[PDB]
DNA sequence: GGAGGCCAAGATCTCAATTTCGTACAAGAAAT
């Protein structure tokens, strides 16, 4: 739906692995109650992976906020260095702007 | 003391499997932590589209391309699919039987 | 209606093969394997779906699927096993609470195991044990995968009860050129005679069922061809 | 009428056809070779077995079935006024030239001796026993297509519905009253052509080297050892001229090496 | 007309063994190896497969129970039929071979035959072998040997009067002369065989029929011993069998199986729990396993598995998870149209 | 008194041979 075009048409480097992750896993996080599995090697961008399908579904009732997981500062303060200067701007392209926690 | 708790608990919960039975199934579980830990090695040579990398694997006990039968043959999961190819052409440094069968 | 690419299987041999005359072809492998997936005995179905998942020759009327070629290591060989049935008239089936044998001066009328009608069958059948056994065939992996790890389906003869052909660790490797029917002239495949390729005469039906429809001239392979396992994985 | 065991009969079972007897008109296909009675003009035999079961046999069949004890002698003393029959020889052979219609009795000496003086007359009969098979195939010029009967055996079914006419020594088939299923004519293929070329090439290897080639290619064919470890025979001792003759298949080696044991 | 692949592990509670003609010679009793001494034993899945088709075979004679004279209906036509699947009386459903499928009347009349096949008539039921998942999973089992039950208890002599502690007496002399010379007999039976490996051809087949008549003097020694035939202090050869609790892996299919047929199986499998022993040595316990079976069908229309539930059968009981599987079990029970007769 | 039902004989023979899985590290806490 309008995640790819907002990804594409703001610049950002959209893959083919990239998209079967957004829609399956914001197909997962759509059923209640339900866990996803998932493998993601490196050059997926696992991190936007599970992120714009948190920006998908923030569309349905944005009120709802995610908690990111995460082990150590091996893979965390990454996602700080990529949420920020990515995934704010298709949020921008898509209206949601929506402000970042951190809770460490 | 993993084996012996897991059979304490599998004897208390009333399971009839052999105290071997476990050994084994905490064996493959460690195989399988293995495979993952390898598969987060392999994950540090490459972080971008253009890492090229000489992964060099020193252990006699990697299953080679042609030893099928090996007792570890999961472990060339560490590998990624889409370098599978390089795994079946690869260098081996000290391989086995290198000579030609006439029983082809 | 997929797109197809040259794919080899390579699987760990569980148990002994029972060679069919005819070498088993992938496609027959196949055929069982969507007779299943989709219930369907009647062939026309099942070899629809199988067009949809393999590659079928129009102008030989056959599928690329090359048969059975034996994957045989330095370490394990080709062997000469015997698959061997044999009737188990255990005390429990010789007895009057599964059936009420014929009587005479309240003594039961013990069933001739030795011979005739009611005797214990040894059926004895050659049966190939070679470690791997390897197919090629132009296909979709995903499809074909699949059906040979999450099917019923063996190699050889009778693998729907005698279990014979058991597989495990199917490998599929994408392969570089079409090995599935010909190979510098060599059939792989149950292929028509006038196809040119030389090989082995016999008389067979070209797309599976193997055992239903005319059979017809055909030119088959070897029933047991060996390779080794180094030059089966060179591709 | 076209079918092997007709060729058979007319070969070697017709000459029990004074002690065999006038057919019974019949309306259902024969049990024994399980044709259909569009061939046997619509007469046949009507039969029961030791096992009580209403069996029709058509004028080949028969002849496996019939009691000839002044031609073929008495095969059981115990039980004198049943003598020899076709159907219930084991270790007995025969080969018949179907083009010929003359067939030879491959038989042991003791079945040899039980047969009276008449029945020599009407067959030839050389002694010899289930493993002097192969060695009488080798040494004579076989005439084709023949019909090559290892074991009579007992299972009479099993041996007609067995048949196989061998059309050329590429392909002889070994009918010895087992069921010859297309999954077990490898074990009853005799490819004497290629036997007979891996005998001549034996020639060039010492005694030594020959029995270290079959030794070697036996364990390999039972899986005793590596293919490894018998290539590395095979070339310590110079013996891949003799592996280039070998069928791929490990059951046909296994009968040619019975046969070159043989001879 | 659905595919339920059983896909499962079979615990082995105690060790599984099989005689196979083919595996066993006289070095020893093996398992089929599928190649080598070195290669991985699997137990076949014609043994599994005739297992299950008895206890088909039981369900369906209980089933049906008996007669008012108290006797099974089955006749041995029938009886035969239903358990090796052989037309003995020569009155069956001929087929036209080229019908794949042929028989849906008798199918659906007579389960058992539609699970497992008669002559003629393809079956439905495939059962696989259980293929370790180890390397070591197999061992030398059994074995032992028969004591004289007299020379290792004493207690049992004061039981016996001093005409049997003579032929106690005798039996154990005629042993020990025996055992000598059936020694010195196989001495030089295995210097034949030393002769046999020379093969130096000028007398080979003599000195095989002179091994032949060896055998024979081995069986006139052994006729010679008039208290006793066979020795009683036997070392006893161990049998190969699966280690207690291995891991072996099981395919089982049902292909294109109607609800009652599903559920016939199904039933088996839970008579067979009852009694959950595979292949032989029965007096050890041999065959007593305990298996798991994850029961999944093939998605109409496409080539995915979906999960209809798990058999789980243990020393504890028979867990029949998923309400398909119940549903089939129901069906076959309530359905009155089996006539597993003529 | 002809139908079962058990039991003994039929001559020959192929061939093949074994010695021990896996040995760790992190990072990071509102606690059991
Ligand atoms: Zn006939």
Redesign the pocket.
């Known amino acids: 739906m309008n995640t790819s075009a907002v990804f594409e048409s703001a610049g950002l480097s959209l893959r083919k692995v990239q998209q079967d992750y957004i829609e399956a896993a914001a197909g997962a996080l759509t059923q209640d109650h339900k866990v996803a599995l998932i493998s993601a090697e490196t050059g997926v961008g696992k991190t936007l992976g599970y992120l714009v399908p948190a920006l998908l579904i923030l569309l349905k009732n944005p009120e709802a906020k995610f908690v990111i997981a995460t082990?150590?500062?091996?893979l965390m303060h990454q996602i700080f260095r990529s949420d920020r200067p990515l995934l704010e701007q298709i949020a921008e392209q898509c209206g949601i702007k929506v402000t970042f926690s951190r809770l460490? | 003391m993993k084996a012996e708790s897991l059979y304490g608990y599998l004897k208390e919960r009333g399971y009839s499997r052999t105290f071997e039975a476990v050994?084994?199934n905490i064996?493959l579980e460690?195989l399988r932590?293995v495979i993952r830990?390898a598969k987060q090695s392999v994950g540090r040579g490459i972080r971008s589209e253009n890492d090229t990398v000489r992964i060099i694997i020193l252990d006699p006990?990697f299953p080679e391309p042609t030893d099928l039968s090996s007792?570890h043959r999961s472990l060339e999961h560490i590998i990624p699919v889409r370098f599978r190819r390089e795994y079946r052409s690869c260098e081996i440094l000290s391989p086995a039987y290198f000579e030609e069968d006439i029983q082809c | 209606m997929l797109n197809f690419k040259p794919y080899r299987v390579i699987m760990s041999s569980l148990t002994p093969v029972v060679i069919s005359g005819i070498a088993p072809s992938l496609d027959g492998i196949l055929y069982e394997a969507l007779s299943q997936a989709i219930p369907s005995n009647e062939p026309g179905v099942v070899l629809a779906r199988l067009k949809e998942i393999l590659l079928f020759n129009d102008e030989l009327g056959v599928f690329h699927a090359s048969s059975l070629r034996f994957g045989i290591t330095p370490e394990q060989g080709i062997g000469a096993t015997?698959s061997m049935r044999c009737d188990y008239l255990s005390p429990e089936k010789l007895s009057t609470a599964m059936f009420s044998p014929?009587?005479?001066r309240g003594?039961?009328?013990?069933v001739?195991l030795?011979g005739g009608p009611t005797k214990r069958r040894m059926t004895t059948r050659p049966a190939y044990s070679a470690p791997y056994l390897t197919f090629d065939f132009v296909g979709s992996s995903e499809a074909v995968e699949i059906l040979l790890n999450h099917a019923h389906v063996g190699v050889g003869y009778d693998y729907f009860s005698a279990a014979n052909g058991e597989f495990n660790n199917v490998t599929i490797l994408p392969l570089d050129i079409d090995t599935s029917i010909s190979n510098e002239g060599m059939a792989l495949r149950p292929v028509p005679v006038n196809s040119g390729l030389n090989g082995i005469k016999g008389v067979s039906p070209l797309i599976p069922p193997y055992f239903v429809g005319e059979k017809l001239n055909i030119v088959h392979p070897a029933p047991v061809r060996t390779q080794l396992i180094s030059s089966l994985l060179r591709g | 009428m076209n079918h092997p065991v007709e060729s058979v009969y007319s070969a070697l079972t017709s000459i029990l056809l004074p002690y065999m007897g006038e057919p019974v008109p019949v309306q259902r296909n024969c049990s024994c070779c399980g044709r259909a009675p569009s061939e046997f003009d619509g007469v046949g035999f009507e039969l029961v077995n030791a096992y009580?079961e209403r069996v029709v046999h058509c004028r080949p069949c028969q002849t496996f079935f019939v009691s000839a004890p002044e031609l073929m002698g008495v095969?059981?003393?115990?039980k004198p006024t049943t003598g020899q029959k076709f159907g219930?020889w084991?270790?007995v052979g025969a080969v018949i030239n179907v083009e010929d219609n003359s067939s030879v009795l491959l038989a042991?000496?003791?079945?040899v001796n039980?047969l009276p003086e008449h029945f020599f007359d009407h067959v030839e009969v050389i002694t010899a026993?289930?493993?002097?098979h192969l060695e009488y195939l080798f040494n004579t010029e076989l005439k084709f297509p023949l019909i090559y009967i290892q074991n009579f055996g007992?299972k009479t079914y099993e041996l007609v519905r067995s048949l196989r006419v061998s059309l050329s020594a590429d392909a002889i088939y070994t009918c010895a009253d087992q069921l010859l299923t297309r999954q077990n004519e490898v074990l009853y293929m005799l490819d004497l052509k290629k036997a007979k070329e891996l005998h001549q090439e034996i020639k060039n290897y010492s005694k030594k080297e020959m029995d270290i080639f079959?030794?070697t290619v036996?364990?390999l064919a039972?899986s005793?050892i590596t293919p490894e470890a018998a290539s590395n025979e095979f070339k310590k001792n110079n013996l891949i001229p003799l592996l280039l003759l070998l069928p791929t298949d490990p059951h046909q080696r296994?009968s040619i090496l019975?046969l070159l044991?043989?001879v | 007309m659905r595919t339920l692949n059983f896909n499962g592990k079979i615990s082995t509670l105690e060790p599984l063994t099989v005689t196979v003609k083919?595996a066993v010679?006289?070095?020893?009793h093996?398992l089929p190896r599928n190649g080598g001494?070195?290669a991985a034993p699997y137990f076949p899945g014609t043994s599994i497969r005739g297992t299950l088709r008895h206890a088909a075979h039981k369900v369906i004679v209980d089933r049906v129970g008996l007669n008012a004279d108290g006797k099974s209906p089955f006749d041995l036509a029938e009886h035969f039929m239903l358990a090796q699947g052989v037309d003995i009386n020569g009155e069956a459903e001929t087929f036209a071979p080229g019908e794949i499928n042929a028989g849906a009347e008798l199918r659906s009349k007579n389960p058992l035959i539609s699970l497992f096949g008669r002559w003629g008539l393809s079956g439905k039921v495939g059962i696989g072998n259980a293929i370790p998942d180890?390397?070591?999973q197999w061992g030398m089992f059994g074995g032992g040997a028969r004591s004289i039950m007299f020379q290792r208890d004493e207690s049992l002599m004061e039981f016996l009067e001093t005409d049997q502690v003579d032929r106690l007496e005798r039996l154990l002399e005629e042993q020990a002369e025996a055992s000598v010379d059936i020694s010195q007999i196989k001495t030089e039976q295995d210097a034949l065989k030393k002769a046999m490996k020379s093969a130096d051809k000028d007398t080979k087949?003599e000195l095989?029929?002179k091994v032949?008549e060896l055998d024979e003097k081995i069986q006139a020694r052994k006729d010679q011993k008039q208290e006793s035939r066979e020795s009683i202090r036997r070392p006893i050869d161990p049998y190969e069998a699966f280690i207690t609790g291995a891991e072996l892996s099981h395919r089982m299919s049902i292909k294109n199986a109607t609800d009652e047929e599903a559920g016939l199986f199904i039933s088996a499998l839970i008579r067979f729990a009852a009694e959950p022993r595979f292949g032989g040595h029965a007096n050890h316990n041999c065959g007593l396993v305990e298996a798991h079976w994850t029961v999944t069908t093939w998605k109409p229309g496409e080539l995915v598995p979906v999960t209809l539930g798990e058999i789980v059968i243990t020393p504890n009981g028979v867990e029949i998870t998923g309400d398909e599987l119940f549903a089939m079990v129901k069906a076959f029970n309530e359905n009155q149209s089996f006539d597993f007769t003529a």
């Open positions: 082990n150590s500062h091996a460490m | 050994n084994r064996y460690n932590k830990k006990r007792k | 015997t014929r009587t005479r003594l039961f009328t013990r001739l030795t | 009580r095969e059981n003393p115990k219930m084991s270790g042991p000496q003791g079945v039980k026993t289930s493993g002097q007992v079959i030794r036996t364990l039972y005793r296994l019975h044991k043989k | 083919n010679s006289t070095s020893g093996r001494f070195n180890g390397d070591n087949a095989q029929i032949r």
